[PDB]
Design a protein around this ligand. Structure first.
Ligand code: AR6
Ligand code: MG
Ligand code: MG
Length: 346
């Protein structure tokens, strides 16, 4: 059902944040360690729920995702002023959730009720060049639950990201992540078709003059997203790719272009079984485990891979033992059901 996909989307994102935050900024993560971390969430056979109820705290990924969804519900539409002020007020209420070091400046400016233009603080970041961080993408999944057409998904993924990420290196990653969640909601089962659809959009977007200018500020590659999506096509066809090669080809970092394609690769790769991951796990669990085993920005890569996998596999593959380990999981589910009731209905 679509309700199952909405609930699974936000729960998968919560799972990625809460489980992956344990490994944040670890340059190397052992797969066995991740397996043991999630095995520790399981109660004895016969006991419902989690062995560690709400023991895994969420971070800024979830705090901002919740503010974004709460704005969409409050206004029953994207409203940039409402969402900007909700981001600022959420940061003020609970600043110690692990926010990016730079974006805090934006939140502080947006606390001013006489800030006339809520996009101006983001435009000022990094000497006016804009943030390329993955914070615009980590929170964007709600956009793809609220809006059904790809035109609207792109439009409002971009605007919602531009409240904090004015560089196209940041907001194009948010658009790519929103498009991937959108495709997963449609049940797109062919990894080739999934990639082809994303690539068509990203080549169009990265042809824009300002997108090229933003990318050239950082280095030689002018189409960071399109280049990585083509790499993903190649990687998926290899019988064996090491984690080291995956990270070398795509990244595992805080930059949106070093994390959003990686999350997409993890989802597409873990459609198939993995001999290193016990067969008892389902495909959503496999996706989260593998993504965290890549290391780096594990909380955000896992929250994005989990949003996609949750939208694709639905709540049936969200295990209660994992879900009920996450701080605020009931509120997350209520928010997902509310988005469904307001925007989707059946
Ligand atoms: N144009 C830029 N130039 C130089 N450094 C940059 C630039 N853009 C980003 N940085 C660096 O990128 C950092 C973060 O960018 P930020 O906009 O503050 O916030 P986020 O919301 O995207 O957080 C990104 C992730 O960081 C945490 O893990 C969070 O949980 C996110 O998962 C800056 O402090 C800079 O060092
Ligand atoms: Mg975080
Ligand atoms: Mg992070």
């Amino acid at each position: 059902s679509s309700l199952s996909r909405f609930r699974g989307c936000l729960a998968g994102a919560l799972l990625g944040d809460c489980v992956g935050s344990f490994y944040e900024a670890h340059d190397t993560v052992d797969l066995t360690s991740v397996l043991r971390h999630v095995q520790s969430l399981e109660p004895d056979p016969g006991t419902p729920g989690s062995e560690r109820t709400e023991a895994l705290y969420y971070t800024d990924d979830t705090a901002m995702a919740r503010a974004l969804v709460q704005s969409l519900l409050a206004k029953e539409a994207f409203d940039e002023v409402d969402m900007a002020h909700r981001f600022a007020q959420e940061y003020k209420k609970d600043p110690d959730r692990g926010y990016g070091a730079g974006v805090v400046t934006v939140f502080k400016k947006l606390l001013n009720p006489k800030c006339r233009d809520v996009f101006e603080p983001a435009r000022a970041q990094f000497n006016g060049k804009g943030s390329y961080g993955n914070g615009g993408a980590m929170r964007v999944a709600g956009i793809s639950l609220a809006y059904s057409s790809v035109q609207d998904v792109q439009k409002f993924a971009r605007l919602s990201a531009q409240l904090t990420h004015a560089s196209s290196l940041g907001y194009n990653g948010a658009i790519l992540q929103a498009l991937a969640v959108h495709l997963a909601l449609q049940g797109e089962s062919s990894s080739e078709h999934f990639l082809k659809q994303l690539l068509g959009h990203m080549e169009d977007l990265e042809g824009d003059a300002q997108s090229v200018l933003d990318a050239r500020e950082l280095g030689m590659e002018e189409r960071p997203y399109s280049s990585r999506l083509k790499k993903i096509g190649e990687l998926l066809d290899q019988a064996s790719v090491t984690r080291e090669e995956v990270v070398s080809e795509l990244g595992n970092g805080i930059a949106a272009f070093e994390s959003v394609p990686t999350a997409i690769y993890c989802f597409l790769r873990c459609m198939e079984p993995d001999p290193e991951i016990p067969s008892a796990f389902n495909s959503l669990q496999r996706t989260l485990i593998y993504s965290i085993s890549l290391g780096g920005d594990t909380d955000t890569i896992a929250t994005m891979a989990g949003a996609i996998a949750g939208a694709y596999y639905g709540m049936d593959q969200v295990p209660e033992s994992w879900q009920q380990s996450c701080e605020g999981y009931e509120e997350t589910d209520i928010l997902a059901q509310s988005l469904h009731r307001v925007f989707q209905k059946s």
